[PDB]
Amino acid sequence: SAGGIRRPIQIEEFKTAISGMSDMELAQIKTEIENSINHLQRSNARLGKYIAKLEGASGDLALYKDSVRENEIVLNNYNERVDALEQETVYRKTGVDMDNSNVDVVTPNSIFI
Amino acid sequence: LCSFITQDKMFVSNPIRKVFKPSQGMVVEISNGNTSSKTVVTLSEPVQGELKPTVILKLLKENIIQMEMIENRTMDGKPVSLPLLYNFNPDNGFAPISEVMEDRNQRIKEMYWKLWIDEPFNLDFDPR
Amino acid sequence: EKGSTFGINLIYVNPFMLQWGIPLIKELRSKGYPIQFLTIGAGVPSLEVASEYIETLGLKYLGLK
């Protein structure tokens, strides 16, 4: 699918495209993005080790730092795209009177005549 | 071999290829094959047991491809020709062949008149 | 001019454009509008996506960037 393609996509164009799709297509995209999230989080775990190993000891440290900084920009797009999946999902679970006040029967005309 | 042709602007499939799609029975004769300007290729199919010519694809004037297309099952024995006309322009090398759309329907009605109506051919009468 | 051709550039990172654009080509191609090729820009689609683009759209070549 064109949604969740391992690279960051603009949200407003996703927020429209998500509307005109089938429910099984949204579940396929939702599965695909979560796999993309686990791919970056296991990537950031590996980048986290190479930070903590060299932080224990400044060339070839800033290059690890903007690599994990860049992954947070792409990951910020993923959970924003997952947030649009949640909002599209929740839109599809909505779609005696003795006073002569009423009838003035003191008068001969009021009865029915 | 040119996959599609041009109908005025649009790209409809090449009908010359569609007609010459090979099946059992059809027989193609080529005459003057080594000289472009006068070459004549001729399809023949079985028609009522015996073998009759059906399509004559050849050159008219310098840049008009005529697909003379023949029905032999007629009213009076006289076989009837449908002159399909096609502009050959060799500059636009991608799609050289463009169909002549000018008076196209009226050539088609001519043939179908001769198959159905016995009257003199005249189309200029009010439908009302 | 009669017989002239041109192509389309669709941006892959804009999925909305893909959601209306791709079926628009197939519609226009089925009626036989003089479209020669499609270029997908700003990214490369996967095998299964490309596969749909090649087989279904009656194009002649594909632009990838």
C57 to chain B, closest Cα gap in Å? 14
Q: What is the DSSP letter of C32?
A: T
Q: Which helix (H) or strand (E) holds B55?
A: strand B50-59
**How many other C-beta atoms lie within 10 A of the C-beta of residue A113?**
6
Q: Are C3 and B87 in contact (CB under 8 A)?
A: no
- Backbone dihedral angles phi then psi of residue A73, each to the nearest 5 degrees: -70, -45
Beta-carbon separation of C14 and A7 below 8 A: no
Residues C26, C19: Cα–Cα separation, whole Å: 12
List the structure tokens of A111: 């009865």
Give the SS3 label for residue B73: coil
Q: What is the resolution of this structure in A?
A: 4.6
DSSP state of B10: B
Length of chain C: 65
Contact C3 B92 (CB under 8 A): yes
User: Nearest CB to A5: which of C16, C19, C43?
Assistant: C43
CB B9 within 8 A of CB B99: no
- The amino acid sitting at A105 is V
A83 neighbors A77 (Cβ within 8 angstroms)? no
- Judged by CB atoms closer than 8 Å, whether chains meet at C15 and A7 is answered as no
- Please tell me the distance from the alpha carbon of residue A102 to that of residue A65, in angstroms, as a whole number: 87
Alpha-carbon distance C25 to nearest alpha carbon in chain A (angstroms): 17
CA dihedral sign, ordered A43, A48, A51, A56? negative
The span from the CA of A94 to the CA of A91, in Å, is 6
Encoded tokens for B57: 């694809």
- Select from A14, A8, A18, A10 the least CA-distant residue to A89: A18
Instruction: Give the CB-side neighbour count of residue C65, counting CA atoms within 13 A.
Output: 11
Q: If you compute the radius of gyration of chain C from its CA atoms, what whole number of angstroms results?
A: 12
Burial letters B40-77, b for 16+ CB under 10 A, else e: ebbbbeebeeeeebbbbbeeeeeeebbbbbbeeeeeee
Give the method of determination: X-ray
- The answer to whether the beta carbons of residues B43 and B22 sit under 8 Å apart is no
Measured between alpha carbons, how far is B31 from B17 in angstroms, rounded to an integer?
19
Those chains having 3 or more beta-carbon pairs within 8 angstroms of chain C are A, B
Distance CA C1, CA B108 (A): 27
Contact present, A68 and A48 (Cβ < 8 Å): yes
CA angle A34, A35, A41 (to 5 degrees): 85
SS3 C10: strand
Q: In terms of C-beta density within 10 A (0-12 exposed, 13-18 middle, 19 or more buried), how is residue B7 classed?
A: middle
DSSP β-bridge partners for residue B13: B4
Strand B80-88 to strand B64-71: parallel, antiparallel, or no bridges (unpaired)?
antiparallel
Are C2 and B101 spatial neighbours (Cβ–Cβ below 8 Å)?
no
How far, in Å, CA of B98 to CA of B88, rounded?
7
Residues 6+ apart with CB under 8 A from B126: none
Integer Cα distance of A57 and A72 in angstroms: 25
Q: Which of B62, B56, B113, B47 is nearest to B84 (CA)?
A: B56
Backbone angles phi, psi at A17, to 5 degrees: -60, -40
**Pairing mode, strands C35-41 and C61-64:** parallel
Q: Give dist(CA B17, CA B59) in Å, integer.
A: 17
CA distance C19 to C37: 18
List the structure tokens of C45: 């689609």
Q: How far is CA A6 from CA A28, C21, C45, in A?
A: 14, 22, 11
